[PDB]
Design a protein around this ligand. Structure first.
Ligand SMILES: O=C(CC(c1ccc(F)cc1)c1ccc(F)cc1)Nc1cccc(F)c1CC[C@H]1CN[C@@H]2CCCS(=O)(=O)N1C2
Ligand SMILES: O=C(CC(c1ccc(F)cc1)c1ccc(F)cc1)Nc1cccc(F)c1CC[C@H]1CN[C@@H]2CCCS(=O)(=O)N1C2
Ligand SMILES: [Cl-]
Ligand SMILES: [Cl-]
Ligand SMILES: [Cl-]
Ligand SMILES: [Cl-]
Lengths: 99, 99
């Protein structure tokens, strides 16, 4: 689909069998979601935002569906204000910016 | 153009007579630029995101040139770690997400 930007580009994602709302964010290097349980081991990671840095948990090779498109990749879990789909997964679903 | 997302979508912008590098950010509702002088009235505002909040100066009806396209809108000026072009200006240049 073609998504205009008059409103937030919010989509439904499915992760761990649950539906959640997330924002398609070209300004985010990686994907970060609010607290939830994910399988496997995690690694430490620091990500920087407008307000400063936060610690997150990095989970690898996580199955995630984005607006019905199947992706498998890195998902960070932490104190984010909104669920964000970053470039690591936008590239998997073949998302580009056009003007 | 068609901008892929393997790397950060950085573009050159012209604002208040100055050339700056800025990130095309679909997750940002509005444009945020690092400390600089802009003409006219302004109002203080606090904006939040990953890492917390920053205090900014909200300037209205600011002209910005992005990839040769002139756009007018609100520009928030403050201690952001990167200049970000938000949806308020991306809509004006006809920028869409496509997948
Ligand atoms: O990708 C970056 C780093 C990036 C940067 C690039 C050039 C630089 F030289 C320095 C760092 C950056 C940092 C702050 C920022 F405001 C924009 C980009 N962080 C990140 C990584 C993973 C997930 C994530 F949600 C973020 C954060 C994205 C931002 C921007 N899109 C949304 C819009 C509201 C602001 S935010 O900070 O909450 N946020 C979500
Ligand atoms: O938009 C947010 C705050 C927002 C959020 C969401 C859920 C929460 F529990 C808490 C904060 C958020 C954070 C990260 C993200 F990736 C996307 C959105 N900040 C921001 C970041 C960068 C640029 C920018 F102009 C803004 C400010 C946008 C304004 C206008 N439009 C809305 C309207 C209410 C006023 S406001 O000043 O907060 N604001 C949001
Ligand atoms: Cl959706
Ligand atoms: Cl990944
Ligand atoms: Cl505006
Ligand atoms: Cl349009």
């Amino acid at each position: 689909p073609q998504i205009t930007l008059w409103k937030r580009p919010l989509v439904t994602i499915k992760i761990g069998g649950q539906l959640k709302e997330a924002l398609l964010d070209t300004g985010a290097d990686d994907t970060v979601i609010e607290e939830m349980s994910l399988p496997g081991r995690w690694k430490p990671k620091m990500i920087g935002g407008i307000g400063g840095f936060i610690k997150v948990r990095q989970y690898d090779q996580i199955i995630i569906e984005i607006c019905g498109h199947k992706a498998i990749g890195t998902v960070l879990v932490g104190p984010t204000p909104v669920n964000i789909i970053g470039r690591n997964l936008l590239t998997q679903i073949g998302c580009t910016l056009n003007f």
